[PDB]
Amino acid sequence: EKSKLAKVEKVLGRTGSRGGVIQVRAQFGRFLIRNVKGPVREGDILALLETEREARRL
Amino acid sequence: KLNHAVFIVITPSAIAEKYKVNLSVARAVINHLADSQKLYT
Amino acid sequence: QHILRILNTNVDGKEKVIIALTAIKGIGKRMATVICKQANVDPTKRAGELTTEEIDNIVHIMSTPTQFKIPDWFLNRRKDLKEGKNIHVIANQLDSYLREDLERMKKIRLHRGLRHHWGLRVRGQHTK
Amino acid sequence: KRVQTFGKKKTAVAVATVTNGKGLIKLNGKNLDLVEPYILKTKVYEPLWLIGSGKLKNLDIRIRVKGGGQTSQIYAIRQAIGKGIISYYQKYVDESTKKELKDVLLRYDRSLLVGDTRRCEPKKFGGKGARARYQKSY
Amino acid sequence: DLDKLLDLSQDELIKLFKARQRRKFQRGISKKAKSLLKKIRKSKKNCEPGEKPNPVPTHLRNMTIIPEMVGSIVATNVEIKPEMIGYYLGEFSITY
Amino acid sequence: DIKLFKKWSYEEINIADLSLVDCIAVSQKACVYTPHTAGRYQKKRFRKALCPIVERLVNSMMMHGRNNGKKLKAIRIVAYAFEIIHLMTGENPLQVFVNAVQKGGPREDSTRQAVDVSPLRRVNQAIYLICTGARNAAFRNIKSISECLAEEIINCANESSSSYAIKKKDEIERVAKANR
Amino acid sequence: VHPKKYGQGSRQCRVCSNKHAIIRKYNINICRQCFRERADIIGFKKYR
Amino acid sequence: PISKKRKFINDGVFQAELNEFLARILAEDGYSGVEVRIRELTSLVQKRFFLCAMAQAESLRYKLLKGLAVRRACYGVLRHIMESGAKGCEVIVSGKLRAQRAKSMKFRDGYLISTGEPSKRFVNTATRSAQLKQGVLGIKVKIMLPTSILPDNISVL
Amino acid sequence: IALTSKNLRAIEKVCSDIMKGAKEKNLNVSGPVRLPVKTLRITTRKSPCGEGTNTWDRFELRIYKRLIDLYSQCEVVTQMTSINIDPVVEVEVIITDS
Amino acid sequence: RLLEPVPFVKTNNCIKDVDADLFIRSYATHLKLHNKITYPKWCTFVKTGKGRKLAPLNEDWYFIRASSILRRLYLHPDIGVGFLRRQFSSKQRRGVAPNHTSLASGKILRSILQQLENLGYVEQNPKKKGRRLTTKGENAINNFARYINKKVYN
RNA sequence: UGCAUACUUUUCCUCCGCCGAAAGGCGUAGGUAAUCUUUAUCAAUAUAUAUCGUGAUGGGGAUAGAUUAUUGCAAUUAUUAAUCUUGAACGAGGAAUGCCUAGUAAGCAUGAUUCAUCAGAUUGUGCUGACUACGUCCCUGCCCUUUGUACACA
RNA sequence: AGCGGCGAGUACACUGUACUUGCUGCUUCUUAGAGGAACAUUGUGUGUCUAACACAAGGAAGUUUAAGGCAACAACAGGUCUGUGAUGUCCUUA
Ligand SMILES: [Mg+2]
Ligand SMILES: [Mg+2]
Ligand SMILES: [Mg+2]
Ligand SMILES: [Mg+2]
Ligand SMILES: [Zn+2]
């Protein structure tokens, strides 16, 4: 429920069989490789809830 | 259903909600008070 | 009088006069308005606050409007088939007239009448 | 003395004749008091507000509008005003002031000086619109 | 009345009728209509008060009925009453 | 002086999200007096970020076929809503709107498994949700659209699950949680 | 003989006497298929 | 008195008619012309009024009528075209042709541009339907002329 | 003088020639004014039959009307007009004081 | 209601510098006060144009119409009956078939024009085309506009 | 009512002036067209102010009944149009499936084509101006390399 | 086609504005011919630092600027002889 700010460093690869999702690297200030559903660029800040649990790279 | 009547912080909707009335009647009431969307205090 | 009776079978409840009037089978909207004008009664008032005298007057007006100022071309049922006058027919009377017309058509064995009897269109429409 | 530029949104060319005068500002034969709808009125007045009402007491303005609908017309008028005032300044008033005005306009938004290049794309057969085709049932 | 109508002029009749018919009358009536009328008249003349006269087979369905043609039968066959008047001919061709 | 609706100045407004600030620009050049901009907000990927929030709201309102391409009406409605906000439940309407926006985005969504949501997308969703809810409230009620919309906005600001958008968001969040 | 002056069967294609599908704009009076073939010679160029 | 638009269309129509008339008349001629023994023709026109592709096509048709081995004729035509300085050619002959069913036969020599306004410009095309034994043989000849320069080339000196 | 024609470049050339002729002497010639090109558009449906996704084709016969004025005597204007010319450009001279 | 802080002065001289609807209303009121124009016979039960399928519902609509016509006349040089009709056109819903534009019932307009000419406000010009304003009438209109402006200012 | 003879505007766009509730009519005027219809405005959504007030309701205009016209040699199986009245289904649509990424979707009209008359069609044109991507191969369809084939009418 | 130029007025402002009749330098708008302008130009990334892409500035415009038109080779036993006096055979011909 408590949202934690993660500034996006680099946008890795556009995942999902249908293409809606992106893989993203985000610094709080630790490297957490996460998924995003919608337009995201470098420098934009995510709304992470369940912080310490990552995604699979491409 | 809600058959509102005619014979017996200001906006028409509010009036309708409160005394159970047609909004023409609400409008009339507003006019009286004063004496196409509305706002009154 | 929340609930009223101007003619053979109406309701005419809480609605604003003209629309209440339109409940009758001279349900013209425009016609109703004209009638109101003829009467000289405020159309912003509701059906329940009307006097009985007023109602009577309205009824009278509705019956044979031709002799009143209200014009000729206007009138519901133009020449009345029965070779004579032009008059607004009103209420169940209208229905009766329609029925009579239908019967006449049937008797004639005109195509339209036949169609009506069948329960098909009349208009010229398709419905394929 | 007197300077003639245009605006342009869709089709809707508002030609702004900006002259020396007392500061009235008009459309064909009518004051900008009217325009038409009360909501959009601000889109015409905005450049004036940006530049200041005292700066236009030296400048009369007439605007001839032709073509387009309502909103487009308004936009065109705005554009004309923007081009117009600035053009006047460039010629008959100083350069620094003109530059300042331009900067102000830029800070507010585009569309005042530079034009909206969009225009109605040709309808294509097999449909009603540009892209919108009809319908297949198989 | 019917008899009265029959008695009075063509103009009057036209005025009485509904507008399409009136318009048609104004326009004219063509060469065939006259012939048809004549035929009808002949039939009437030939008639017996007990049973109706011989029919008159007709190709065309356009004719408006006028007090001339009351009492006889025409065209399959259709008898023409005074109740019909300005309601066209027809009554010919369709099934079910 | 720079202003909106010649009434609510948005020099007084505040934000306190960072991410949302980055996403929605109510700025120096995204100043506006009446929502109707003929901006080129969809010729680029992130040019919708420059778009003022009021404009976005208006666009959202504009939806539903028989009411589609009636920008002016939408604008009027939003103005009315703002006025209502100002009057009853007394606060700077812009601030309220901002608060609602902040509230509105589902932070995590489901997919074919749970994933996070970009700020812009969240904002868009919020905008949509608020308008849709308002529309629903309006439809075959009586109330009026502007009033309903205002109410919805207030609810969003509060962060209270009496309105529809908030409820939807909550549901989405729950789903996400369930997923992961 | 019956009125052949105003109707589809009144006039025809100049080219092949067909009563169907006549381009009747500008008094061309060519049935459209024929026009499509002779659009070059008449001076009708497709641009857009 | 007749309007400008109306006039133009009429003129076009007249031109077309003239062309058709010429085609009808001159089966024995290398026809292209359209600019105004011949006396009769003149009279006819008065009554009415008050290297090249078409020629080649006509020739082909004539040959067909006469009764040759077809392929040979086509080859000859191609050769002639080449001699006359054509950068490219193409002939098609589709129809019945020996067998009953089908049978379209291409005959290209030099390169033949098909797409663009260059095609419209720099090719002369012609279409004749030679009536024969049990139907029609369908000529289409297409000649690419000497260019006034093609858009594809970039000639550095 | 009104020059009606179908072919643009040719028309332009003709106009140029007439201008040149004028510039010799004695002619207060107003410049060539090209008029609104009233384009005859025919939208025919391709395909004789009703088969194939009904493609239309917008033909355009775009007539160029051109206009030019002078203060002169008839013979001189006739002479000027004689640039030889051909069947393509349709000429009309108006010799009115008004 | 209308008034606001603007960045210019308004030369309140002619009717083109006045807000329309309000002006029209004022003119109607003036007319009523005068009793200068009648309300013929058929006025009280006619429909203003094919598309309306319903009576006006304004009581003194005729006066309003007249006022509008005056304004129109002022705006344009020479204006007919047809033009007037076109101006007061609306969408006619043909029930199921889609809407068409609907030309107004011209008779009433014509009558109004006639009345105006009788009173000495409009003028059938033998040069040019159909009925423009007469100079006196124009002047009167201008005066009225000025008055309205003054009232608004007050 | 018919023919013959003489003579001249009208056959299409309609200004305008009168009659007509309306449709339309009659009289005349310009236009063989950047001139006139008409275009510094031919439209509707727009917007502003009133009447309604959630009630199959004044939403909705089907179906019907009876006239007044216009077109046409001819209008019934109603050409279309107008006037009065008739007040049906429908409370946002199941299985399925179509179209679409910026002046686009959608809404709103309108010119032209057919046309003696008649758009709910098509085809152009504009006016009001969204949402959402800015990608992916998950489906669907094409294309490619590999692979397998007893198919080649594949 | 306009814009002014200017006479002539009709209304009202200050010490010009709105509107019509009569007469005749400018080309911004109105028309339409010939030219110009964007080439990923300059800036910075990603890329075998290849072909090229992404971002930023400039700019009227940065998805060949947007939209079409044109349409190879080979077919389909696709449609059309009810478009044709393009056209075969068979039928029909008082
Ligand atoms: Mg090529
Ligand atoms: Mg069709
Ligand atoms: Mg599909
Ligand atoms: Mg095999
Ligand atoms: Zn043909």
Side-chain angles (χ1 to χ4, degrees), chain I:
Chain I
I1 316 181
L3 286 292
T4 49
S5 318
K6 188 165 59 156
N7 213 131
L8 146 61
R9 284 163 178 174
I11 236 294
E12 208 72 6
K13 280 198 81 183
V14 169
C15 98
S16 193
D17 288 318
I18 65 167
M19 276 249 270
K20 114 76 50 51
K23 106 177 281 81
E24 292 294 308
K25 251 169 191 294
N26 210 234
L27 270 306
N28 295 358
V29 277
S30 308
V33 256
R34 289 157 250 87
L35 277 284
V37 296
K38 55 190 184 280
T39 61
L40 296 340
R41 69 193 60 194
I42 306 297
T43 54
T44 295
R45 193 188 164 287
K46 293 164 144 191
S47 344
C49 45
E51 213 270 4
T53 340
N54 46 218
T55 57
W56 294 72
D57 51 355
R58 305 151 230 75
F59 297 93
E60 282 213 329
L61 172 29
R62 41 170 52 263
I63 72 179
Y64 306 102
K65 184 169 181 296
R66 252 218 54 258
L67 197 72
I68 186 168
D69 174 46
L70 38 55
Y71 188 106
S72 187
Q73 211 84 250
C74 291
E75 173 50 43
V76 174
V77 304
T78 61
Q79 109 93 33
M80 295 280 171
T81 312
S82 301
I83 307 287
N84 207 241
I85 211 33
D86 69 315
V88 137
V89 171
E90 281 175 12
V91 194
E92 197 222 48
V93 188
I94 315 92
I95 59 263
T96 55
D97 295 45
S98 296

Side-chain angles (χ1 to χ4, degrees), chain H residues 86-104:
Chain H
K87 184 148 64 277
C89 162
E90 177 186 317
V91 170
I92 95 191
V93 187
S94 62
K96 293 266 286 213
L97 203 43
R98 283 61 170 282
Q100 283 266 37
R101 158 175 156 73
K103 194 169 163 277
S104 183

Side-chain angles (χ1 to χ4, degrees), chain H residues 113-116 152:
Chain H
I113 195 179
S114 54
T115 307
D152 306 59

Side-chain angles (χ1 to χ4, degrees), chain E residues 44-56:
Chain E
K44 281 204 80 193
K45 153 262 173 175
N46 189 40
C47 84
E48 195 191 328
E51 195 173 316
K52 274 63 71 79
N54 58 336
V56 43

Side-chain angles (χ1 to χ4, degrees), chain H residues 24 90 101 106 108 114-116 129 131 134-136:
Chain H
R24 290 293 174 285
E90 177 186 317
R101 158 175 156 73
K106 246 61 157 60
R108 275 173 284 267
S114 54
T115 307
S129 183
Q131 73 187 132
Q134 297 288 331
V136 276

